[PDB]
Each structure stands twice: as C-alpha cells, then as structure tokens.
Amino acid sequence: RPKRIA
Amino acid sequence: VPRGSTSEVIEDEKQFYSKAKTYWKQIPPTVDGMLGGYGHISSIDINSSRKFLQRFLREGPNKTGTSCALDCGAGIGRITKRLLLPLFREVDMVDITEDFLVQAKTYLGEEGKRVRNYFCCGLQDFTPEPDSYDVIWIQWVIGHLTDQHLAEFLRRCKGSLRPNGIIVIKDNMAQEGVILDDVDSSVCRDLDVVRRIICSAGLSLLAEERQENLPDEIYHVYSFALR
Ligand SMILES: Nc1ncnc2c1ncn2[C@@H]1O[C@H](CSCC[C@H](N)C(=O)O)[C@@H](O)[C@H]1O
C-alpha cells in the first residue's frame, strides 16, 4: 500500500 | 551497509506472513483501506497505469493481447474495476484476504460479472495456469513476499503468460536498501534490489517509469513492465 516514508 | 535482502531484515518468516494476514484482516474493504488512507490518489494512479499499459497494446508483432488479465493482491478490485475490466475480456483476481474478495463482488457491480476466478490464496502459494494471461498486474503487494518467494512467484507468472504477454510490477521503492515495516509486515526495496530479483526470475525490463504527482511524503512509486 502507499505510505509515508519511515 | 544498506541491507540487500529480506533475510537481513525478517526475523521469522512464519511471523512475517502471519502478521501481514492479521493486519489486512482488520482493514476496511474500501479504496481508502487498500490505499492506506490515500484513497484520493487513486485516479492519478489509474490514469498513469493506463497510459503505461497502452504502450504495449499498439498493433504490431509484439502487441499484448486483451483476452485475460490477472490482478495480484487485487484487494477489493480497485485496479480490476477502473483499469483492467475495461480493457480485458476477462480478469482473474488473487488476494490473501477473503473479506476483500467478498466485497469485490459488490464493488465491481455488473462489470464484475466478467471476473472469472476469485482466488483466495497467498501469492507465495499461488501457481497461475500456464499460457493464460496477457497481463499480470502486481501492484502494492511485492513487499509482502520474501525475496525467495517473490523470485519464485515471478517465475510461475512467467510460465502463465500468453504469447506477447507482460508482467507489470507497480510499487513503492526505497531510496536505498531493504526497509522493514513491522506494522503491516512488509518490506520496501530499492530499485537495484528489485531489478536483481526480476533478473533472477529470468525476466527482462521492457519499461520502467516513476509515478508522478504523488504527495511529497510517501515512498516513490515505480512501474516495471517485464517479459
Ligand atoms: N502474501 C500475499 N498474497 C496475496 N495477497 C496479499 C498478500 N499479502 C497482502 N496481500 C494483499 O495485498 C493487498 C495490498 S493493498 C493493494 C490492493 C490493490 N493491489 C490496489 O492497489 O488497489 C491487500 O488486498 C492484501 O490483502
């Protein structure tokens, strides 16, 4: 899924 | 060093898969659940996917056919609905989360009558029928497989392509290395790692493209077309 860069 | 394989970051493979299954089981069967709160990007995504695919559909010796596609980690069928069903006579779906496939039947509406098989299986356990698909679409799921399972899955996919068929991977890519997300139990790999895996599966790159117009804060996303 698309997601914020950790 | 950065990490270059999943065996550097996955403590326990059974737990890596079990945790992912548990995570998806408690996500709502909606586009926003599929896209992790970024449901609003769907149209940008589908528009770019469509343009990318249409490169392979022009008339000529190598024209990709339009009889059957396979949507891998399809979820509720966001991609099946807006990209694939309009272009392919039939579409098969595979996903690990039974609730998503059940919701698909509602989400897809009347056009969903052209979904042939709904396979409820992990990719790591799925062997697509030989010589069956013109396009195998794998979006936002490869991070859920180990390197060995991904390489193997891409080999089985290769064996299920029709003449002139292609495999498309579209996913998040890390700036460098292999990065574990321990909440959804997935990894994000850099472009060199992903290309290494594609090559180990006996596949070659036809095209690679960065997804534009995404929010600044999320992982970069790339599409690869393979055969
Ligand atoms: N090991 C695995 N095998 C198959 N599907 C998996 C899986 N691990 C996670 N999934 C599925 O992968 C999907 C990630 S969300 C992306 C959904 C779809 N590709 C889209 O872009 O709209 C979920 O539907 C989840 O159930």
Side-chain angles (χ1 to χ4, degrees), chain A, chain B residues 172 181 184 217-219:
Chain A
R1 72 206 177 81
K3 73 179 64 175
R4 174 185 292 280
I5 291 179
Chain B
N172 304 333
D181 184 339
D184 69 9
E217 80 268 7
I218 64 171
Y219 284 108

Coordinates of all heavy atoms in Angstrom, one line a residue, chain A, chain B residues 172 181 184 217-219:
Chain A
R1 N 0.9 -1.2 0.0 CA 0.0 0.0 0.0 C 0.9 1.2 0.0 O 2.0 1.2 0.5 CB -0.9 0.0 1.2 CG -0.2 0.3 2.5 CD -0.9 -0.3 3.8 NE -0.1 -0.1 5.0 CZ -0.1 1.0 5.7 NH1 -0.9 2.1 5.3 NH2 0.6 1.2 6.7
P2 N 0.4 2.4 -0.5 CA 1.2 3.6 -0.4 C 1.3 4.1 1.0 O 0.4 3.8 1.8 CB 0.3 4.7 -1.2 CG -1.0 4.1 -1.2 CD -0.9 2.6 -1.2
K3 N 2.4 4.7 1.4 CA 2.7 5.0 2.8 C 3.8 6.0 3.0 O 4.7 6.2 2.1 CB 3.0 3.7 3.6 CG 4.4 3.2 3.3 CD 4.8 1.9 4.1 CE 3.8 0.7 3.8 NZ 4.2 -0.5 4.5
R4 N 3.7 6.7 4.1 CA 4.7 7.7 4.5 C 6.1 7.1 4.6 O 6.2 5.9 5.1 CB 4.2 8.4 5.8 CG 5.2 9.3 6.5 CD 4.7 9.8 7.8 NE 3.5 10.6 7.6 CZ 3.5 11.9 7.2 NH1 4.6 12.6 7.1 NH2 2.3 12.5 7.0
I5 N 7.1 7.7 4.1 CA 8.4 7.3 4.3 C 8.7 7.3 5.8 O 8.6 8.3 6.5 CB 9.4 8.3 3.6 CG1 9.2 8.1 2.1 CG2 10.9 8.0 4.0 CD1 10.1 9.1 1.2
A6 N 9.1 6.1 6.3 CA 9.5 5.9 7.6 C 10.8 6.7 8.0 O 11.7 6.9 7.1 CB 9.7 4.4 7.9
Chain B
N172 N 6.0 0.8 -4.3 CA 6.9 1.6 -3.5 C 8.3 1.2 -3.6 O 8.6 0.0 -3.6 CB 6.6 1.6 -2.0 CG 5.2 1.9 -1.7 OD1 4.5 2.7 -2.3 ND2 4.8 1.3 -0.6
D181 N 8.8 -2.6 7.3 CA 7.6 -2.1 8.1 C 7.0 -3.2 9.0 O 6.3 -4.1 8.5 CB 6.6 -1.5 7.1 CG 5.4 -0.8 7.9 OD1 5.1 -1.0 9.1 OD2 4.7 0.0 7.2
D184 N 2.5 -3.3 9.1 CA 1.8 -4.1 8.1 C 2.6 -5.4 7.7 O 2.0 -6.2 7.0 CB 1.3 -3.3 6.9 CG 2.4 -2.8 6.0 OD1 3.6 -3.2 6.2 OD2 2.1 -2.0 5.1
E217 N 5.3 13.2 0.8 CA 5.8 12.4 2.0 C 5.8 10.9 1.9 O 6.3 10.3 2.8 CB 5.0 12.8 3.2 CG 3.6 12.2 3.3 CD 2.5 13.0 2.6 OE1 2.7 14.1 2.0 OE2 1.3 12.5 2.9
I218 N 5.3 10.3 0.8 CA 5.2 8.9 0.7 C 6.4 8.3 -0.2 O 7.0 9.1 -0.9 CB 3.9 8.4 0.1 CG1 3.6 8.8 -1.3 CG2 2.7 8.8 1.0 CD1 2.4 8.2 -2.0
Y219 N 6.6 7.0 0.0 CA 7.6 6.4 -0.8 C 7.3 6.7 -2.3 O 6.2 6.6 -2.8 CB 7.6 4.9 -0.6 CG 8.2 4.5 0.7 CD1 7.5 4.1 1.8 CD2 9.6 4.6 0.9 CE1 8.1 3.7 3.0 CE2 10.2 4.3 2.1 CZ 9.5 3.8 3.2 OH 10.0 3.6 4.4

